[PDB]
Nucleic acid binder design. Structure first.
Ligand SMILES: [Mn+2]
Ligand SMILES: [Mn+2]
Ligand SMILES: [Mn+2]
Ligand SMILES: [Mn+2]
Ligand SMILES: [Mn+2]
Ligand SMILES: [Mn+2]
Ligand SMILES: [Mn+2]
Ligand SMILES: [Mn+2]
Lengths: 132, 132, 132, 132
DNA sequence: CGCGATAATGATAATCATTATCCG
DNA sequence: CGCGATAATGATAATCATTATCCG
């Protein structure tokens, strides 16, 4: 077996060839690509693949914590393979590189801001725009 | 109060002020909250003629021209507000009021993160989502 | 104006950039391509294009006699720019070339076969499979 | 009549004849019409246990093995029949009975068209659609 | 004429026939 | 095990917010 299939086998999901390929595509990606970009990269590896399927997988994979959905501004949701720890993003406004970053002190403050306004933080989003 | 903060900005920016641009300028200057475009249409009919096509065109120009801030609060439609002289961020009740806040310290850290990466931050999006 | 836009202008349809491009794609095509193949060829000419739009156009263009829909066997419908006269197809089973062909005597026989079984022929389909 | 034309073909072709393959073989040998897969399922339940998954798998094998002819009559589902010793073609009531026919002369011409093109025809699809 | 009326666009979900997975 | 139960697939239509076209 492999990392993709094992997750699916353990998560009670049917391992299909396309789920496998989509999984692999996200696996060796540097950038955060939109759903089409995944569809293209998948169909390059294995043609037996629908856009409808690439949409159905991302939703599920997100629901199952196998991949994270971001939304950096443009209509398109960008997708990345869920990482070992949470990370936020710093977008270079010039040559649009993305920098993953982690800050423990912030998440705390953020949950403190929740418990101040009588809230429980079910999720957050932090993106920082920058220039050299 | 006879010419709104935003109508003043159009004037300064040399852009032509139509009765509808004026009306939507009213509505946006009025609002402490963050209406979607539909609410900006309703709020603008409670004053004058204004078409939907138009309300759309306008809140776009305004946004393009830095007069407005567009928010996506994970609920379909875009939501809008006048560009705040006093920067705030957003806690969203996932169930649906949007409490605005400022953490002088989250700001503090954000600046450091960008510094510690060799990037001066020129904007950021920080949103919190939760329940009580 | 041009051939595409004139048809649309005369057919009471809004000329959009994508309708224009899709039209052009079909215009300089040798083969009969599926909807994806059109989507790819379109996006090569002008990126501002949805698959959903490429689907919506083909239906309309067919409904408006601007392009013909065939179905040569595989799931995919193939599409060609509606020609000056009806033609049927001869598929080379070896190196899958398609040969357009016209036969007046057959259509007659076909309408005779209609009027024999008390029918009115609203449409037909003839494809011939061949080898050298 | 105890082993059907089609069960005989499996036997000859060395393929394994299961009770369900046998039953669907019955049903297909029985039918003068052209049932969709659902009707082939109903007709096969009116004899034995047979699952839908299975009816699908079978009429596919049969079709793959040249025992069956698949038709698409422009109405969603595929429709099926035993491979006729006597070739016919199809007039479809667009409103929904399918009268079978033979034009010894359309056959005549088809052969010529392919000849006049330098191709021996090894199969053809000719369907007529109409109302009274 | 920048606007209104309105239909087209685009991202993505839905539908439904057919297909593959999994399991016993 | 080729099968049943069932969910996944693929082509394509539907939805709905936003956008462009056209016209006066
Ligand atoms: Mn964070
Ligand atoms: Mn990331
Ligand atoms: Mn902030
Ligand atoms: Mn605000
Ligand atoms: Mn013909
Ligand atoms: Mn043709
Ligand atoms: Mn024939
Ligand atoms: Mn028949």
């Amino acid at each position: 077996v492999s990392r993709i299939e094992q997750r699916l086998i353990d998560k009670g999901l049917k391992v299909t060839d396309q789920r496998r390929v989509i999984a692999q595509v996200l696996s060796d990606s540097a950038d955060h690509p939109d759903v089409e970009e995944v569809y293209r990269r998948a169909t390059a590896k294995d043609p037996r693949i629908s856009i409808a399927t690439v949409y159905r997988t991302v939703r599920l994979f997100e629901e199952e914590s196998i991949l994270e959905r971001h939304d950096f501004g443009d209509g398109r949701a960008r997708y990345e393979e869920a990482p070992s720890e949470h990370h936020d993003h710093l977008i270079d406004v010039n040559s649009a590189r993305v920098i993953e970053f982690t800050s423990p002190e912030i998440e705390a403050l953020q949950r403190e801001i929740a418990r101040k306004h009588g809230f429980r933080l079910v999720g957050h989003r932090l993106e920082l725009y920058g220039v050299p």
